[PDB]
Design an enzyme around this catalytic site. Structure first.
Site, PDB file in Angstrom:
ATOM      1  N   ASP A 139       0.568  -1.214   0.063  1.00  0.00           N
ATOM      2  CA  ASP A 139      -0.032  -0.151   0.047  1.00  0.00           C
ATOM      3  C   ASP A 139       0.789   1.651   0.059  1.00  0.00           C
ATOM      4  O   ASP A 139       0.833   2.527   1.053  1.00  0.00           O
ATOM      5  CB  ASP A 139      -1.006   0.027   0.856  1.00  0.00           C
ATOM      6  CG  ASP A 139      -2.136   1.234   1.443  1.00  0.00           C
ATOM      7  OD1 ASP A 139      -1.841   1.918   0.326  1.00  0.00           O
ATOM      8  OD2 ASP A 139      -2.752   1.209   1.971  1.00  0.00           O
ATOM      9  N   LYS A 142       2.195   3.225  -6.605  1.00  0.00           N
ATOM     10  CA  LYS A 142       1.546   2.402  -6.455  1.00  0.00           C
ATOM     11  C   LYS A 142       2.705   1.160  -7.789  1.00  0.00           C
ATOM     12  O   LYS A 142       3.119   0.510  -8.014  1.00  0.00           O
ATOM     13  CB  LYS A 142       0.421   2.555  -7.834  1.00  0.00           C
ATOM     14  CG  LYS A 142      -0.506   2.971  -6.344  1.00  0.00           C
ATOM     15  CD  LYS A 142      -0.454   2.269  -5.293  1.00  0.00           C
ATOM     16  CE  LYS A 142      -1.886   3.018  -4.294  1.00  0.00           C
ATOM     17  NZ  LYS A 142      -0.892   1.661  -2.749  1.00  0.00           N
ATOM     18  N   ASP A 167      -3.320  -3.217  -2.057  1.00  0.00           N
ATOM     19  CA  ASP A 167      -4.719  -2.153  -1.940  1.00  0.00           C
ATOM     20  C   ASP A 167      -4.339  -1.328  -3.403  1.00  0.00           C
ATOM     21  O   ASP A 167      -3.706  -1.462  -3.835  1.00  0.00           O
ATOM     22  CB  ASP A 167      -4.234  -0.614  -0.795  1.00  0.00           C
ATOM     23  CG  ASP A 167      -5.105   0.087  -0.669  1.00  0.00           C
ATOM     24  OD1 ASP A 167      -7.106  -0.538  -0.785  1.00  0.00           O
ATOM     25  OD2 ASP A 167      -5.423   0.852   0.160  1.00  0.00           O
ATOM     26  N   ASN A 168      -5.733  -0.885  -3.602  1.00  0.00           N
ATOM     27  CA  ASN A 168      -6.299  -0.080  -4.948  1.00  0.00           C
ATOM     28  C   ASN A 168      -5.259  -0.516  -6.270  1.00  0.00           C
ATOM     29  O   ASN A 168      -4.718   0.798  -6.873  1.00  0.00           O
ATOM     30  CB  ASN A 168      -4.724   1.358  -4.465  1.00  0.00           C
ATOM     31  CG  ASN A 168      -5.024   2.144  -3.003  1.00  0.00           C
ATOM     32  OD1 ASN A 168      -4.691   2.482  -2.107  1.00  0.00           O
ATOM     33  ND2 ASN A 168      -6.452   2.672  -3.113  1.00  0.00           N
ATOM     34  N   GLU A 197     -11.158   4.239   0.178  1.00  0.00           N
ATOM     35  CA  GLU A 197     -12.061   4.949   1.970  1.00  0.00           C
ATOM     36  C   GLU A 197     -12.355   6.019   1.300  1.00  0.00           C
ATOM     37  O   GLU A 197     -12.410   6.754   0.698  1.00  0.00           O
ATOM     38  CB  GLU A 197     -10.481   5.013   2.091  1.00  0.00           C
ATOM     39  CG  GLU A 197      -9.451   6.187   1.576  1.00  0.00           C
ATOM     40  CD  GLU A 197      -8.813   5.101   0.777  1.00  0.00           C
ATOM     41  OE1 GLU A 197      -8.980   3.592   0.302  1.00  0.00           O
ATOM     42  OE2 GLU A 197      -7.277   5.577   0.555  1.00  0.00           O
TER      43      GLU A 197
HETATM   44  N1  LIG Z   1       8.935   3.131  -1.244  1.00  0.00           N
HETATM   45  C1  LIG Z   1       8.647   2.786  -0.771  1.00  0.00           C
HETATM   46  N2  LIG Z   1       9.055   2.637   0.428  1.00  0.00           N
HETATM   47  C2  LIG Z   1       8.299   2.840   2.051  1.00  0.00           C
HETATM   48  N3  LIG Z   1       8.159   4.177   1.725  1.00  0.00           N
HETATM   49  C3  LIG Z   1       7.026   3.871   0.729  1.00  0.00           C
HETATM   50  C4  LIG Z   1       7.606   3.742  -0.295  1.00  0.00           C
HETATM   51  N4  LIG Z   1       6.497   4.491  -0.973  1.00  0.00           N
HETATM   52  C5  LIG Z   1       5.708   5.545  -0.351  1.00  0.00           C
HETATM   53  N5  LIG Z   1       5.799   4.891   0.536  1.00  0.00           N
HETATM   54  C6  LIG Z   1       4.646   5.284   1.410  1.00  0.00           C
HETATM   55  O1  LIG Z   1       3.049   4.642   1.833  1.00  0.00           O
HETATM   56  C7  LIG Z   1       2.939   5.415   2.207  1.00  0.00           C
HETATM   57  C8  LIG Z   1       1.498   4.721   1.108  1.00  0.00           C
HETATM   58  S1  LIG Z   1      -0.380   5.550   2.762  1.00  0.00           S
HETATM   59  C9  LIG Z   1      -0.403   4.322   3.594  1.00  0.00           C
HETATM   60  C10 LIG Z   1      -1.197   4.090   3.779  1.00  0.00           C
HETATM   61  C11 LIG Z   1      -1.922   2.460   5.129  1.00  0.00           C
HETATM   62  N6  LIG Z   1      -1.157   1.803   4.919  1.00  0.00           N
HETATM   63  C12 LIG Z   1      -3.129   2.763   5.367  1.00  0.00           C
HETATM   64  O2  LIG Z   1      -3.929   2.043   4.940  1.00  0.00           O
HETATM   65  O3  LIG Z   1      -3.439   3.354   6.756  1.00  0.00           O
HETATM   66  C13 LIG Z   1       2.745   6.821   2.371  1.00  0.00           C
HETATM   67  O4  LIG Z   1       2.933   7.447   4.085  1.00  0.00           O
HETATM   68  C14 LIG Z   1       4.413   7.330   1.881  1.00  0.00           C
HETATM   69  O5  LIG Z   1       5.568   8.039   2.555  1.00  0.00           O
HETATM   70  O1  LIG Z   2      -5.119   4.241  -0.857  1.00  0.00           O
HETATM   71  C1  LIG Z   2      -4.763   5.561  -1.774  1.00  0.00           C
HETATM   72  C2  LIG Z   2      -5.802   5.789  -2.004  1.00  0.00           C
HETATM   73  C3  LIG Z   2      -4.297   6.935  -3.122  1.00  0.00           C
HETATM   74  C4  LIG Z   2      -5.307   7.978  -4.012  1.00  0.00           C
HETATM   75  C5  LIG Z   2      -5.670   9.051  -3.605  1.00  0.00           C
HETATM   76  C6  LIG Z   2      -6.011  10.773  -4.749  1.00  0.00           C
HETATM   77  C7  LIG Z   2      -7.048   9.777  -4.882  1.00  0.00           C
HETATM   78  F1  LIG Z   2      -8.118  10.338  -6.143  1.00  0.00           F
HETATM   79  C8  LIG Z   2      -7.846   8.580  -5.011  1.00  0.00           C
HETATM   80  C9  LIG Z   2      -6.858   7.283  -4.028  1.00  0.00           C
HETATM   81  C10 LIG Z   2      -3.722   7.344  -2.540  1.00  0.00           C
HETATM   82  C11 LIG Z   2      -2.650   6.139  -2.057  1.00  0.00           C
HETATM   83  C12 LIG Z   2      -1.321   5.840  -2.282  1.00  0.00           C
HETATM   84  C13 LIG Z   2      -0.506   5.252  -1.435  1.00  0.00           C
HETATM   85  C14 LIG Z   2      -1.645   4.006  -0.817  1.00  0.00           C
HETATM   86  N1  LIG Z   2      -2.889   4.117  -0.260  1.00  0.00           N
HETATM   87  C15 LIG Z   2      -3.328   5.453  -1.345  1.00  0.00           C
HETATM   88 CL   LIG Z   3     -14.455   3.186   4.026  1.00  0.00          CL
HETATM   89 MG   LIG Z   4      -4.085   2.742  -0.425  1.00  0.00          MG
END
Ligand SMILES: Nc1ncnc2c1ncn2[C@@H]1O[C@H](CSCC[C@H](N)C(=O)O)[C@@H](O)[C@H]1O
Ligand SMILES: Oc1cc(-c2ccc(F)cc2)cc2cccnc12
Ligand SMILES: [Cl-]
Ligand SMILES: [Mg+2]
Length: 213
Positions: A139, A142, A167-168, A197
């Site tokens: 997560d 991407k 995710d996603n 979400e």
């Molecule tokens: N290569 C990488 N290694 C570690 N963290 C990374 C990364 N690329 C992005 N991130 C981190 O990935 C996160 C995505 S959002 C994570 C949401 C969390 N899993 C939840 O559901 O609560 C961000 O905080 C971003 O800083």
């Molecule tokens: O759950 C996530 C959602 C989005 C997201 C951001 C903007 C949008 F308009 C829609 C979706 C980004 C993420 C990036 C990292 C981990 N999770 C994500």
């Molecule tokens: Cl939700």
């Molecule tokens: Mg996500």
């Protein structure tokens, strides 16, 4: 302050210390009523919970921690002695996540590693004494899902039955990962349709179980 600091403070003032469910509920309320944030959320979180309960993993790796929502959600369901490692590149977010876990009372179950997954994954065996992983929650950004899956396999961190949960896979989407795992004999895949979400927008999770080489 930042949005992440606001989320943390909201939790601290609207949840019960040591009660992970109250923490999840406070984050979900804040992100529904005040400010959206990229937590996995409750719709997809319920699917994650069902998966975690099914597999009862002893060692889980999460890629991307953010404010700690998913870490709290997974760690609250781990059996005694089971552990979560979460990787987070952004130091400000790592500090939120640590504080969130501390408030939830889950800090003994979770280690938050501050760094990029592509740098930390090769250290897991020697520095962090990992043999193989039972589950990986993808997560993070991407474009890292496929390279890090391939790295995990190169590093010998996957075993027969390791569960990847991504995710996603619809929004924002991860098209190279999804095509890869769905086309590979080394993964058995299942799609779980859900919602982004806090939003009336379709999203989904992919479960990809590693089958060995
Ligand atoms: N290569 C990488 N290694 C570690 N963290 C990374 C990364 N690329 C992005 N991130 C981190 O990935 C996160 C995505 S959002 C994570 C949401 C969390 N899993 C939840 O559901 O609560 C961000 O905080 C971003 O800083
Ligand atoms: O759950 C996530 C959602 C989005 C997201 C951001 C903007 C949008 F308009 C829609 C979706 C980004 C993420 C990036 C990292 C981990 N999770 C994500
Ligand atoms: Cl939700
Ligand atoms: Mg996500």
């Amino acid at each position: 302050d930042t949005k992440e600091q606001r989320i943390l403070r909201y939790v601290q003032q609207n949840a019960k210390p040591g009660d992970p469910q109250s923490v999840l509920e406070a984050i979900d309320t804040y992100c529904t009523q005040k400010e959206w944030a990229m937590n996995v959320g409750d719709a997809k979180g319920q699917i994650m919970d069902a998966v975690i309960r099914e597999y009862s993993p002893s060692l889980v790796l999460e890629l991307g921690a953010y404010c700690g929502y998913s870490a709290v959600r997974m760690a609250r369901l781990l059996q005694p002695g089971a552990r979560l490692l979460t990787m987070e590149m952004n130091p400000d977010y790592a500090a939120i996540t640590q504080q969130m876990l501390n408030f939830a009372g889950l800090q003994d179950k979770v280690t938050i590693l501050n760094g990029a997954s592509q740098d930390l994954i090769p250290q897991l065996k020697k520095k962090y004494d990992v043999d193989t992983l039972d589950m990986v929650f993808l997560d993070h950004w991407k474009d890292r899902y496929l390279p890090d899956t391939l790295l995990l396999e190169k590093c010998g961190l996957l075993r027969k039955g390791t569960v990847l949960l991504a995710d996603n896979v619809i929004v924002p989407g991860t098209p190279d990962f999804l095509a890869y795992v769905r086309g590979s004999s080394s993964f058995e895949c299942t799609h779980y349709s859900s919602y982004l979400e806090y939003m009336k927008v379709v999203d989904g999770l992919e479960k990809a179980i590693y089958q060995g080489p």
